[PDB]
C-alpha cells in the first residue's frame, strides 16, 4: 500500500487516429500516443517494440505519453501489432509494470485498371468516321471508382472525362485526331480510401483506312462489229464488259447512262457484266461510261469507270 506493487493499466491510442498507415505516413515519422492509468505515480517509462525496433518515452504528469516512431517500422511490422510495456514509480519508490498491444492496418497502395473498347464498330477509322465525332469508351476496374478522372492525348489533343456510377466512361473524340494517331495511352487516376493516389493505364490501338481502291472496267464492242444498224436499233442490245481489280467484287453495281436513260446490272463471278439496252438509246448516244461502285471492308466506297464509243448506221 506503501510497500505494494503499483497496479496500472497501459493504453495505446489508435495509430494515427484512424488505425491506418498509408504510403505518406509510412514514408515519414509517426506519433504514437497513449495513457497510463491506475495507481498514482510520479514518473514512468513506456517501451514500444515495432518491427524489432525499440522506442521509448516518458509519461507526462497527466498520465499521457507520446513518441516519434519510423513509419517504415510500422509498415514493415510483420503482425501489424505494436507491443508496449510500461514501468512507473511513485514518490515512496513503489513501482508497477503493465503490458499492452495495439493492432493497426497497413494500406500503402491500391490497384486500378482500365480498358478501352474498339474505336468504332470494327476498330477501323474509315473516311466518313474521320470527319465525324467518334465515341471512345471503356470501363475501369479493381480499386478505380466512379468520379475518377479518365484522360488521353490523341494527336496532341487532351481529352478528359469522368468515371460514371457503373464504372464505364466515354468521351467524344474528333475523327481527324483518331485518323492521325492510331495508338495512344488512356489513364484513370484517383485516390483510395486511405488517401493513396493511384493510376491505371492501357494502350488503345486501332487502324486507319480512309479509301477504297478502283480497279479496271472495260466495255466490249457494241454488237460484234461495234456498229448499230437499223435492225439492231429497232431491238434490244446486250451491252457487256469487264470489272476486276482493286476492291471490285462480284455483286458490285454497274451503272450505264445512255441517251438520258439509266441501266444497271451487277458484276458476275468471272468479273464480267452484261445488261440489256434499248437499241433506240444506243442509236442516239454514240459514247457512254460504265461505272462500277465498290467498297472495302472498312466501308469506304469507290467508283471505277470504263468508257465506250460506237458508231451508227
| Interface positions with Ca ion (CB under 5 A) | 16, 18, 20, 77, 79, 81, 118, 120, 122-124, 181, 183-184, 190-191, 206, 209, 223, 225-227, 285, 287-288, 296, 310
User: What cell was used for 313?
Assistant: 448506221
Instruction: For residue 95, give the C-alpha cell.
Output: 513501482
Rounded least distance, CB 5 to Ca ion, Å:
27
Residues making up the chain, counted from first to last: 313
List beta partners, residue 161: 150
The set of cell numbers assigned to 202 is 492501357
Of the pair 39, 302, the CB lying nearest Ca ion is at 302
Whether the CA torsion 17, 21, 24, 26 is positive or negative: it is positive
* Of residues 135 and 191, the one with the C-beta less far from Ca ion: 191
Which helix or strand (DSSP H or E) is residue 25 part of?
helix 23-26
What is the nearest approach in angstroms of Ca ion to the Cβ of residue 230?
Answer: 10
Closest CB 49 distance from Ca ion, rounded Å: 7
225 is in an annotated binding site: yes
Q: Annotated binding residue at 296?
A: yes
CB of 154 vs Ca ion, minimal distance in Å:
8
Residue in this structure with the C-alpha cell 474521320, named with its chain if needed: 130
Please report the sign of the dihedral spanned by the C-alpha atoms of residue 126, residue 131, residue 132, residue 134.
Answer: positive
Q: Are strands 112-116 and 133-142 parallel, antiparallel or unpaired?
A: antiparallel
Backbone angles phi, psi at 281, to 5 degrees: -70, -40
Q: Is 20 annotated as a binding residue?
A: yes
Least gap, CB of 93 to Ca ion (angstroms): 33
Is residue 247 a known part of a binding site?
no
Residue 135 known to bind ligand: no
Nearer to Ca ion, 89 or 180 (CB): 180
Is 223 labelled a binding residue?
yes
Nearer to Ca ion, 124 or 254 (CB): 124
Residues 6+ away with beta carbon under 8 Å from 17: none
157 annotated to bind ligand: no
Nearer to Ca ion, 90 or 196 (CB): 196
Shortest reach from residue 96's CB to Ca ion, in Å: 24
Closest CA to 102 of 85, 122, 86, 84: 84
Q: How far is the CB of 79 from Ca ion (least distance, A)?
A: 5
Residue 252 assigned ligand-binding role = no
Residue closer to Ca ion (CB basis): 6 or 26: 26
Q: Determine the Cα–Cα distance for residues 189 and 274; give it in Å rounded to an integer.
A: 62
Q: Mention every residue, 6+ apart, whose C-beta is less than 8 A from residue 61.
A: none
CA proximity to 185, closest of 212, 220, 155, 221: 155
Q: Is 102 annotated as a binding residue?
A: yes
Nearer to Ca ion, 81 or 238 (CB): 81
Residues 6+ apart with CB under 8 A from 202: 113, 114, 115, 116, 138, 185, 186
Q: Residues within the annotated binding site for Ca(2+)?
A: 16, 18, 20, 25, 77, 79, 81, 120, 122-124, 129, 205, 209, 211, 223, 225-227, 232, 296, 309
Residue numbers in the known binding site for Mg(2+) are 12, 102, 181, 183
Please report, in range form, the residues annotated as the binding site: 12, 16, 18, 20, 25, 77, 79, 81, 102, 120, 122-124, 129, 181, 183, 205, 209, 211, 223, 225-227, 232, 296, 309
Amino acid at each position: 500500500l506503501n510497500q505494494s506493487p503499483l497496479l496500472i493499466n497501459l493504453d495505446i491510442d489508435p495509430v494515427t487516429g484512424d488505425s491506418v498507415i498509408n504510403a505518406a505516413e509510412a514514408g515519414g515519422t509517426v506519433t504514437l500516443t497513449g495513457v497510463v492509468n491506475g495507481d498514482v505515480f510520479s514518473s514512468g517509462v513506456v517501451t514500444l517494440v515495432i518491427n524489432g525496433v525499440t522506442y521509448s518515452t516518458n509519461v507526462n504528469p497527466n498520465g499521457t505519453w507520446s513518441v516519434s516512431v519510423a513509419g517504415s517500422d510500422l509498415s514493415a511490422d510483420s503482425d501489424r501489432i505494436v507491443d508496449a510495456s510500461v514501468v512507473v514509480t511513485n514518490g515512496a519508490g513503489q513501482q508497477g509494470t503493465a503490458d499492452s498491444t495495439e493492432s493497426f492496418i497497413v494500406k500503402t497502395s491500391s490497384r486500378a485498371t482500365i480498358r478501352v473498347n474498339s474505336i468504332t464498330s470494327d476498330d477501323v477509322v474509315n473516311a466518313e468516321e474521320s470527319n465525324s465525332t467518334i465515341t471512345v469508351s471503356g470501363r475501369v476496374g479493381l480499386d478505380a471508382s466512379a468520379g475518377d478522372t479518365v484522360s488521353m492525348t490523341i494527336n496532341g489533343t487532351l481529352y478528359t472525362t469522368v468515371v460514371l456510377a457503373n464504372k464505364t466512361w466515354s468521351v467524344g473524340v474528333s475523327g481527324s485526331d483518331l485518323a492521325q494517331d492510331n495508338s495512344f495511352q488512356v489513364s484513370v487516376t484517383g485516390q483510395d480510401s486511405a488517401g493513396n493516389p493511384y493510376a491505371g493505364t492501357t494502350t488503345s490501338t486501332h487502324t486507319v483506312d480512309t479509301s477504297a481502291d478502283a480497279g479496271t472496267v472495260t466495255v466490249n464492242a457494241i454488237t460484234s462489229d461495234d456498229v448499230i444498224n437499223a435492225s439492231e436499233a429497232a431491238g434490244t442490245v446486250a451491252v457487256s464488259g469487264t470489272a476486276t481489280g482493286g476492291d471490285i467484287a462480284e455483286g458490285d453495281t454497274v451503272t450505264l447512262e445512255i441517251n438520258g436513260e439509266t441501266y444497271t446490272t451487277t458484276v458476275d463471278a468471272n468479273g464480267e457484266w452484261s445488261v440489256d439496252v434499248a437499241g433506240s438509246d444506243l442509236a442516239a448516244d454514240t459514247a457512254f461510261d460504265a461505272v462500277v461502285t465498290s467498297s472495302d471492308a472498312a466501308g469506304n466506297t469507290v467508283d471505277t469507270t470504263g468508257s465506250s464509243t460506237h458508231t451508227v448506221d
